[PDB]
């Protein structure tokens, strides 16, 4: 019966994930998660492949802010600091969630209550790549003080039936870091690309850097962190730009939002679920055809060629090739919080819609 995951009463009510928001679910309880591409490297073998973090300043700051408490943390409650403090990255998108800012304060995604005070929000989980979501309680704290110590004591004291539940991912018990990621696999989340998610954080931003007796001077902390060879790419790599959150976040509809705004052109947020796109840009005044355009959205009916049943899907296109065929990106399709890309035939193409944006 552990608490982290969901429940029987959560799972008869679980819904596919929101595309939009409307008068029921809006920001105020929907959750904000990080989000990873594939590592453009060619792995050694088919199971050796790792995922690349969407870099950002946003997630520089958010380490400053709690690199000493988990530092501090880490040596005392023999705990990895780089675990802990790549869970918070992870779980509350860098600090931008709006479970981890006021007045939630909760940075690692824990369900339940704190000194009985809660806060209801929708949550996504995945059973392999059939993606859904779940409405639960989350512990609501007076401040990110009490977070960070309420997590050292789930992972010290556990749960109800499994108080050792976390215990090989204390540092006695794991000889390195990712020995205590693989642990948070199945225990923590759903999410079956969890440990490769947490392992790319923590290489990334040099998180081991916090596990020593000694903690470093945090003025040379971003001279650490080692850029992604992004020379090669065909294309340029993804950034969330805006603050604002006209659809929920890493969804196909905000990945269109987003990607589109990386090249100076934008599209409203009033669009709703991806199917609706074309249609309804097209009555608001956006330039809409058949004709495959190098960064339009592009739209696929509800139904259309795989995408969704009731949802359809949208995608962003990064080239138009010079046989008619398209070559995309888009979120949510290949695994929950993963950017994937593919290409779509010619014939297929030329069904689709494409909306450039204003
Ligand atoms: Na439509
Ligand atoms: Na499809």
């Given at each position: 019966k552990n608490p982290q995951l969901p429940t029987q009463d959560e799972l008869?009510?679980?819904?596919?994930?929101a595309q939009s928001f409307n008068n029921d679910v809006n920001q105020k309880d929907t959750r904000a998660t990080s989000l990873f591409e594939t590592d453009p490297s060619i792995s050694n073998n088919d199971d050796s492949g790792q995922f690349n973090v969407v870099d950002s300043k946003d997630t520089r700051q958010f380490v400053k802010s709690i690199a000493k408490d988990a530092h501090?943390?880490?040596?005392?409650?023999?705990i990895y600091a780089s675990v802990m403090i790549a869970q918070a990255?992870?779980?509350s998108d860098s600090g931008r969630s709006a479970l981890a800012?006021?007045?939630?304060?909760?940075?690692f995604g824990i369900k339940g209550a704190f000194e009985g005070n809660s806060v209801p929000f929708n949550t996504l989980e995945a059973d392999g790549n059939q993606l859904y979501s779940i409405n639960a309680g989350f512990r609501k704290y007076p401040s990110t003080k009490e977070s960070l110590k309420d997590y050292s004591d789930l992972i010290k004291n556990g749960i109800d039936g499994n108080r050792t539940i976390y215990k090989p991912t204390w540092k006695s018990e794991a000889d390195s870091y990712k020995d205590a990621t693989s642990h948070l696999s199945k225990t923590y989340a759903t999410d079956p690309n969890y440990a490769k998610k947490l392992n790319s954080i923590i290489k990334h931003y040099q998180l081991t850097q916090f596990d020593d007796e000694r903690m470093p001077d945090l003025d040379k902390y971003e001279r650490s962190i080692k850029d992604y060879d992004d020379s090669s790419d065909e294309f340029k790599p993804f950034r969330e730009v805006s603050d604002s959150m006209p659809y929920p976040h890493g969804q196909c509809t905000w990945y269109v939002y987003n990607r589109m705004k990386q090249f100076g052109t934008s599209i409203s947020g009033d669009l709703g679920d991806a199917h609706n796109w074309n249609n309804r840009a097209q009555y608001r005044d956006y330039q809409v055809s058949h004709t495959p355009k190098r960064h339009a959205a592009v739209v696929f009916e509800a139904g259309?060629?795989?995408?969704?049943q009731h949802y359809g899907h949208v995608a962003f296109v990064e080239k138009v090739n010079s046989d008619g065929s398209i070559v995309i990106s888009e979120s949510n399709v290949k695994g929950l919080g993963i950017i994937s890309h593919r290409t779509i035939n010619a014939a297929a193409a030329e069904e689709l819609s494409y909306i450039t944006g204003k």
């Open positions: 008869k009510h679980k819904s596919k994930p501090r943390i880490g040596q005392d409650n023999d990255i992870l779980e800012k006021s007045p939630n304060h909760n940075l259309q060629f795989g995408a969704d």
